Amino acid sequence: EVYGIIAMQAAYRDYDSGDAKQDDNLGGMQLNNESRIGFRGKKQFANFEPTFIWQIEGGYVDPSFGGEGAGLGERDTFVGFESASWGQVRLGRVLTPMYELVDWPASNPGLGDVYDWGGAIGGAKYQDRQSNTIRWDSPMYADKFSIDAAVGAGDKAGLGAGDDYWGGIAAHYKLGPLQLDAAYEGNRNIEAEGQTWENNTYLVGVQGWFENGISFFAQYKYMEADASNGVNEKQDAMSAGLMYTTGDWQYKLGYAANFDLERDGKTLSNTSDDVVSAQIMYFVDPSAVLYARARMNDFNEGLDGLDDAARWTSGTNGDYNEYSVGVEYYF
Amino acid sequence: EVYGIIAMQAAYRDYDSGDAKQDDNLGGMQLNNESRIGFRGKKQFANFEPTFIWQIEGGYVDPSFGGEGAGLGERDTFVGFESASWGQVRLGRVLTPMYELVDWPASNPGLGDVYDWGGAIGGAKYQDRQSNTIRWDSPMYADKFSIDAAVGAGDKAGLGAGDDYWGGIAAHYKLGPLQLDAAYEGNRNIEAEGQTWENNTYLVGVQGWFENGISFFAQYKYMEADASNGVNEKQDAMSAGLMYTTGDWQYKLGYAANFDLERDGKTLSNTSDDVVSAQIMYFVDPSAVLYARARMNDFNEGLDGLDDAARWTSGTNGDYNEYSVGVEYYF
Amino acid sequence: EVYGIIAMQAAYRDYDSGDAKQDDNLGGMQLNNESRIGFRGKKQFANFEPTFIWQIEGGYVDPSFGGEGAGLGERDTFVGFESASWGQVRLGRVLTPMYELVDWPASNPGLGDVYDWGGAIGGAKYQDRQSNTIRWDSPMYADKFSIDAAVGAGDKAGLGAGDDYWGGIAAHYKLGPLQLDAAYEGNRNIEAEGQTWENNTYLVGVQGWFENGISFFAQYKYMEADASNGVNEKQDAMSAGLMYTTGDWQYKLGYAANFDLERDGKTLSNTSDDVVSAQIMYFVDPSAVLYARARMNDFNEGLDGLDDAARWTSGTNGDYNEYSVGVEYYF
Ligand SMILES: CN(C)c1ccc(O)c2c1C[C@H]1C[C@H]3[C@H](N(C)C)C(O)=C(C(N)=O)C(=O)[C@@]3(O)C(O)=C1C2=O
Ligand code: NA
Ligand code: NA
Ligand code: NA
Ligand code: NA
Ligand code: NA
Ligand code: NA
Ligand code: NA
Ligand code: NA
């Protein structure tokens, strides 16, 4: 079976970097086509109660700031097995258990630049998608409690350039209208800035959906990282979102911020990031949505990594504002 | 819906460059797989009168002179809307309105090296299908008249490397068997040769299809460009094609030519290009065609760009001939 | 038509190279997703007795040691015709007639590092999958005898950088439970190491499958190579595999070896490669298998090419073992 996600977002961006040549480059209007075609299926093996499942999901066809074309298997592409009793284990390229919650709901109205990859910490906080991964998903115990857990190979280790590895776990309990989320992910042997890093990261979160139309999510992310030369670094962040949903409309407010980074006890001045964003959404069909959105990004003023050389952060390109309309269709 | 165009052309090329190694390198027999798979569909959003449309079309899987594999969304990939009333707007990656007339009536059979990208002029004449584009296509007004119009971001601006942009318009009037086609396209902020260019291009053409089987097309293309240091360049070109169709056959003769280029009024000697080409075609099935064709390309002798360094044109590889057979199947 | 081949292998590799960082990078566990999706079809042209056939096959979605994503048309992508009379001609990118016998049955389980792309011979022993190729596949005459024959442009010539080319032929006669296999493939205008080479390669082999559950294959590969400065090189190799089948199980044991390389009559010390492997395979569904395997590679100790600079072989990364389970599913 084929399954598309059609996704077009028209987005004009107003950059303020302090260089007007750079400002005109990064700023201006673009089309962020995140449409993707994928294939997936199951087959009942004649000699195996676990149901064989597989999926190949292609990439974004024409993202903004990027070229055209995407191969197959750039997004969640995997084989795995599933039994009703013990859930489903997948091998391949998946989302780590912590990353799922940083994406949804914690990056929801365009906050990702800050809560997703917007970091000041060294090493490697957590992982987007890693293509050398085993991941077990628990069933819904009592249809209320669920465990997600995974281990995998690192970014460099998946190309025979290193021995990066990582593991992570998260759990979700659905208390009536509530849902509580916690998550951990640790990376080892992260080669960066001329040192080898170990990153430990923990996430706490909550979610509610109430008949009056209010929905919300709030999350605390605690990011520690220890370098092999004995340096310590610590940063933490939050993301929350308030939304009212009436009829075929949803109004949404999101705020995310990393706070100042502490290195070796000493705090680094003005290294925090903050994003505010607002979003209207129309439920134009059971299968698709139209939406408008605007956001405000204030980024850090810089950070040197443990190699006398500057470290890259989501803010290394400068502050910017952004207004956008988009459509997204599911089939 | 899945929709292929299966397309193979076996094409031997006899190059005359003035270096027999390059002639042996560039020449010889090759296989030009231009097949492509795409996915496309429409959807009537339950809460919206315009019908939603989308398409993701992959690239040439193994072109000649190139490697294998092409992602999805390398060709016409877009989302958009249509109502009978006001026509059809699509956003994403499309063909500019002038390029449609450069490609369809005017670049086949093999005239492309000359009429398509083969210009000798500086700056950036027009666009061969650019992403970051919105394009509105009108209805057939009075069942005689149709207008195509679109604007979009430049090549560099689509990666945050500049601020080039462009707009273009074309119209089509149908007098009996004839059709008159006119089109304009202008590009701005084109960063090239160390200067910034503004290129305006104007196209007039006609096409006819007659009950006796005689058909033809003829087109005049006018190309302007203004560099930021005050330099001006002007070059013009033509492409015409004649075809007789009897039974299951179409015979075709094609001629296209870029003419001599003027810089600051002074014309630069030997910068013209012209191609001659013949093509026999058999309609092996309603869904496919077989064709044999031979063409002969004579190219320009060189010109420096406005940075003392030679500029690249379709003739920078030297003159060449080419004989070819091919198949084309549509599903 | 769409057709998957879903294929995942979890494979731990233990390298011994003589530098333990290289051992740590290259070694370790990885996920080798060799899943691939393709499209193929046939069409009876209304004015043409040969049946039109076509296929577009994507690449490996996430191989081990490599990144994600593969375009469409990285594997067998072709157009062609088939008649009951004369068999089947295909144009495009296919497997050469010799490489088919080097892959099946002679390279699995895990013998490819030595028998497939493994080698010490200069120039280019053979071609594995080649674009710009026409290949005629004969029928099974008398339901026992068939010819495979193909010629095409070289690797470098398909990008307009040279004129290397090649042809090849193989035959298979089926004497009862055995099948006798012979094959040749010759390459010309192969530029390497500052010389131009002509590569000749010959393969003879046998295959048997018995109701007793015993099945086997053995193959001898003869590779000669002659350089433009008058050097001669010769290397030869062998691969065999013995397997027993009980119920839904297949036991398999494999061995392959390239022998020491001869250059200009004088043999070059410690240039042989040998790999041995054992594998259990379960037939979990008519269309799928589970399998475990372990293998041992001892590779050569180095060889300077005809330019005083080392030549690359499958052993330029060092000896290693590998233990792995995997899955394999069809369409
Ligand atoms: C000056 N210019 C930008 C350069 C510089 C270096 C290059 O190596 C090349 C170009 C032009 C481009 C034009 C492009 C064009 N492009 C896809 C829009 C193009 O349409 C073709 C084509 N065969 O259709 C090219 O030859 C082309 O791929 C090409 O071979 C180029 C090329 O090789
Ligand atoms: Na990653
Ligand atoms: Na789960
Ligand atoms: Na090619
Ligand atoms: Na362009
Ligand atoms: Na139109
Ligand atoms: Na821009
Ligand atoms: Na090859
Ligand atoms: Na055959």
Name the structure determination technique.
X-ray
- Cross-chain residue pair C161–B25, CB shorter than 8 Å: yes
- The closest residue, in CA terms, to atom 9 on ligand 1 is B312
Residues near C169 by beta carbon (within 8 Å), at least 6 away in sequence: C97, C147, C148, C149, C150, C183, C184, C185
User: Which candidate from C28, C33, C71 shows the least CB-CB separation from A157?
Assistant: C28
Report the alpha-carbon angle A328-B2-B7, nearest 5: 130
**Domain around B258:** 1-331
In degrees rounded to 5, what are phi and psi of residue A21? -65, -50
**Cβ–ligand 1 contact at B117 (below 6 Å):** yes
- C-alpha A162/C-alpha C22 separation (Å) is 8
Instruction: Tell me if B312 CB under 6 Å of ligand 1.
Output: yes
Nearest to C296 by CA among C325, C243, C256: C256
Nearest CA to ligand 1 atom 23: B113
Q: Yes or no: say if C255 and C272 are a contact pair by the CB < 8 Å rule.
A: no
Closest residue CA from atom 7 of ligand 1:
B312
User: Which of B7, B2, B11 lies closest to B294 in space, CA to CA?
Assistant: B11
Question: C268 to each of C221, C234, C301, how far by Cα in Å?
Answer: 19, 11, 10
SS (H, E, C) C167-206: EEEEEEECCCCEEEEEEEEEEEEEEECCEEEEEEEEEEEE
Amino acid (one-letter) located at A74: E
Encoding tokens for residue A284? 């134009």
Contact B110, B253 (CB under 8 A): no
Q: Which of A52, A72, A78 sits opposite C37 (nearest CB)?
A: A72
Closest CA to C163 of C126, C200, C188, C135: C188
Rounded CA-CA distance B220/B144 in Å is 22
Q: Report the distance separating Cα B174 and Cα B308, nearest Å.
A: 47
Tell me how far apart the alpha carbons of residues B281 and A170 are, in angstroms, rounded to a whole number.
64
Helices (H), chain B: 20-26, 97-107, 112-115
Any atom of ligand 1 within 6 Å of the Cβ of B128: yes
Closest CA to A255 of A235, A236, A273, A280: A273
CA dist., res. A115 & res. A201, Å (int)? 13
What stretches of B177-248 adopt beta strand conformation (E)?
178-192, 195-209, 214-227, 232-246
- Cβ neighbours of residue B180 closer than 8 Å, sequence gap 6 or more: B172, B173, B174, B204, B205, B206
Kindly state the tokens that stand for C283.
Answer: 């037939």
Q: What whole-number distance in Å separates Cα of residue C23 and Cα of residue B261?
A: 61
- Residues in C lying within 8 Å of A, measured between beta carbons: 2, 4, 6, 8, 10, 24-26, 28-31, 33, 35, 37, 58-59, 61-62, 64-72, 248, 282-288, 327, 329
Tell me, what DSSP letter sits at residue C304?
B
The conformation of residue C311, written as its DSSP 8-state character, comes to P
- Quote helix, strand, coil % in chain C, to nearest 5: 5, 60, 35
Give CA separation, C264 vs B107, C166, C227, in Å.
55, 24, 11
Q: Exposure of A143 by Cβ count < 10 A (0-12 exposed, 13-18 middle, 19+ buried)?
A: exposed
Note residues around ion ligand 6 (Cβ under 5 angstroms).
Answer: B 137, 146, 148
Pick the residue of C163, C188, C196 with the most B CBs within 10 A to test the interface with B by mutation: C163
Q: Tokens for B224? A: 């302007």
Asked if residues A144 and A170 have their Cβ atoms less than 8 Å apart, the reply is: no
Query: Alpha-carbon Rg of chain B, whole angstroms?
Result: 21
One-letter amino acid of B300: N
Selection from A252, A300, A293 nearest residue A274 by Cα: A300
How far apart are the C-alpha atoms of C29 and C11, rounded to whole Å? 6
For residue A201, which of A165, A158, A234 has the smallest C-alpha distance? A234
Q: Are C200 and C227 in contact (CB under 8 A)?
A: no
Q: How far apart are CA B250 and CA B283, in angstroms?
A: 8
Q: Name the 3-class secondary structure at B196.
A: strand
Phi, psi of C114 (to 5 degrees): -105, -50
- Kindly give, in sequence order, each residue whose CB lies less than 8 Å from that of residue C205, ignoring residues fewer than 6 positions away: C101, C106, C180, C181, C182, C183, C217, C218, C219, C220
State the nearest Cα–Cα gap between C159 and chain B, in angstroms. 4
Which residue, among A119, A99, A110, has the nearest Cα to A316 in the 3D structure? A119
Q: Which is the closest atom of ligand 1 to the Cα of B311?
A: 1
Amino acid in the structure at residue C45: F
CA angle (C322, C66, C271) in 5-degree steps: 50
Q: Which atom of ligand 1 is nearest to the CA of B63?
A: 23
Q: Do residues C195 and C231 lie in contact, with contact meaning Cβ atoms separated by under 8 Å? A: yes
Rounded to whole angstroms, how far apart are CA atoms A92 and A101?
A: 20
Q: Note whether B237 and B256 are within 8 A (CB).
A: yes
Q: How remote is the CA of residue B171 from the centroid of ligand 5, in Å?
A: 22
**Contact by Cβ (8 Å): C79, C91:** yes
Q: Which long-range contacts (CB under 8 A, 24 or more apart) does A16-21 make?
A: A16/A318, A16/A319, A16/A320, A17/A317, A17/A318, A17/A319, A18/A318
Which residue is it, tokens 């990656």?
A: B93
* Alpha carbon distance C168, C187 (integer Å): 9
CA of B306 to the centre of ligand 9 (A): 58
CA distance A105 to B170: 45
Structure tokens at C8: 């995942």
- Which of helix, strand or coil describes residue C102? helix
* Closest to A268 (Cα-Cα) out of A91, A121, A81: A121
Q: Residue C156 is encoded by which pair of tokens?
A: 């470098």
Interior CA angle at A36 toward A34 and A39, to 5°?
160
Helices assigned H by DSSP within C46-96: none
Distance CA C118, CA C107 (A): 11
**Ligand positioned closest to the Cα atom of B97:** 6
CB A74 within 8 A of CB A58: yes
**Partner residue opposite C69 with nearest CB, options A43, A70, A163:** A70
Q: How many other C-beta atoms can be found within 10 angstroms of the C-beta atom of residue A238?
A: 17
What is the H or E stretch that residue B114 is in? helix B112-115
How many domains does chain A contain in total?
Answer: 1
Distance separating alpha carbons of residues A114 and A240, to the nearest angstrom = 12
Resolution of the entry in angstroms: 3.4
How far, rounded to the nearest angstrom, does the alpha carbon of residue C312 sit from its chain's CA centroid?
Answer: 18
| C211 φ, ψ (degrees, to nearest 5) | -60, -20
- Strand pairing category for C249-258 and A129-137: unpaired
To which H or E segment does residue B283 belong? strand B273-285
Cα–Cα distance between A277 and A254 in angstroms, integer?
6
Sign of CA dihedral B101, B104, B106, B111: positive
Output Rg (C-alpha) for chain C, integer angstroms: 21
* Minimum-distance CB partner of C71 among B69, B283, B331: B69
Spatial neighbors of A199 by CB under 8 A, at least 6 apart, are: A121, A123, A124, A125, A126, A185, A186, A187, A190, A223, A224, A225
Rounded CA-CA distance C216/C242 in Å is 5
B102 backbone φψ class: left, alpha, beta (φ>0; ψ -120 to 50): alpha
Is there a contact between B269 and B277 (Cβ–Cβ < 8 Å)? no
Cα B60-B64-B65 angle, rounded to 5 deg:
120
Bridge partners of residue C33, in order along the sequence: C8, C62
CA A201 to chain centre: 14
Size of interface B-C (CB pairs under 8 A): 122
* B214: amino acid identity, one letter: I
As a 3-state breakdown, chain B gives helix, strand, coil percent values, each rounded to 5, of 10, 60, 35
Spatial separation of the C-alpha atoms in residues B185 and C295, rounded to whole Å: 63
d(C-alpha C234, C-alpha C262), whole Å:
5
Query: Does the CB atom of residue B63 touch ligand 1 within 6 A?
Result: no
| Structural tokens at position C142 | 């008398």
Residue B319 Cβ inside 6 Å of ligand 1? The answer reads: no
- The Cα–Cα gap between A304 and A306 comes to 7
Spatial contact of B309 and B195, defined as CB atoms under 8 Å apart: no
